[PDB]
């Protein structure tokens, strides 16, 4: 019964239409993609030398927000669920950055492409910082002048946006239904005329405007939902959508298991 229709498709954004689903299901899917899809992000920073003009926790916070490739993060384990001593290859990825300015003039920029993966899970595509192209330099991390050096060792772990927003795979999820307000879910503020004081929705041409002689239909419910999912590059848009669906299914199955075990 539920239907999916895709309008625009890209690596980092998909614009789709959901139909024959409840509003609660679409909203829960949006919330799950925003807050509950696991990714990989730097969580521990060991600073061996930092003589820049930036504080240590400043650089640590900036490092936490760098999106890393999280394609195979489902096969990784949570650090608290790993029986290993300290950090191992099955629950963490180790990256290392070493920067320095050579010469007595000029300034050197430290980019996220300078992060080098040293260890991680065998044959899993996780850990590398995301890059738009092969010639892209990435995110600006710091700036160094002469005799200033930065030497750090970072540990990337698996987590969700409920613990910290650095683990969120999405940036913003547009969400919208009923562009012509046939369900009367909103009451439009106006000065003279509500019709000409409010801009038309971008999906107003996807639905037939109501007829002037039509009467209010009290039996109708929201049926078609338009949403765009934008990702930070750590995951592709289809991956985010599928993993959100899977996470919701796993939560429901856990509830069902607790119910059956309650007897």
């Amino acid at each position: 019964e539920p239907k999916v229709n895709i309008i625009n498709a890209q690596d980092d954004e998909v614009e789709l239409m959901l139909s024959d689903v409840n509003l609660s299901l679409a909203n829960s899917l949006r919330r799950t993609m925003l807050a509950e899809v696991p990714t990989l992000a730097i969580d521990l920073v060991e600073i061996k030398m930092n003589t820049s003009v930036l504080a240590d926790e400043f650089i640590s916070h900036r490092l936490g927000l760098i999106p890393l490739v999280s394609e195979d993060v489902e096969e990784m384990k949570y650090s608290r669920d790993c029986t290993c001593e300290d950090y191992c290859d099955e629950c963490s990825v180790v990256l290392e950055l070493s920067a320095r300015h050579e010469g007595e003039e000029g300034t050197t920029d430290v980019y996220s492409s300078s992060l080098i993966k040293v260890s991680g899970p065998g044959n899993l595509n996780v850990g590398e910082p995301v890059r738009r192209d092969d010639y892209d330099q990435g995110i600006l991390l710091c700036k160094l002048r002469n005799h200033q050096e930065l030497n750090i060792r970072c540990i990337a772990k698996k987590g969700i946006a409920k613990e910290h927003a650095k683990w969120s795979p999405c940036s913003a999820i547009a969400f919208e239904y009923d562009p012509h307000n046939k369900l009367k879910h909103t009451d439009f503020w106006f000065e003279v005329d509500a019709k000409k004081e409010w801009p038309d929705s971008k999906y107003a041409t996807w639905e037939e405007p109501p007829k002037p002689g039509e009467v209010f239909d009290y039996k109708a419910k929201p049926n078609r939902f338009y949403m765009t999912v934008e990702t930070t590059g750590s995951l592709k848009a289809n991956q985010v959508f599928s993993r959100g669906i899977k996470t919701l299914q796993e939560k429901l199955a856990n509830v069902l298991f607790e119910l059956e075990n309650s007897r």
Binding site: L44, H61, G64, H164
Partner: peptide, 8 residues
Amino acid sequence: RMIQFDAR
């Protein structure tokens, strides 16, 4: 001594 931060 070792210096560690939580990147948050």
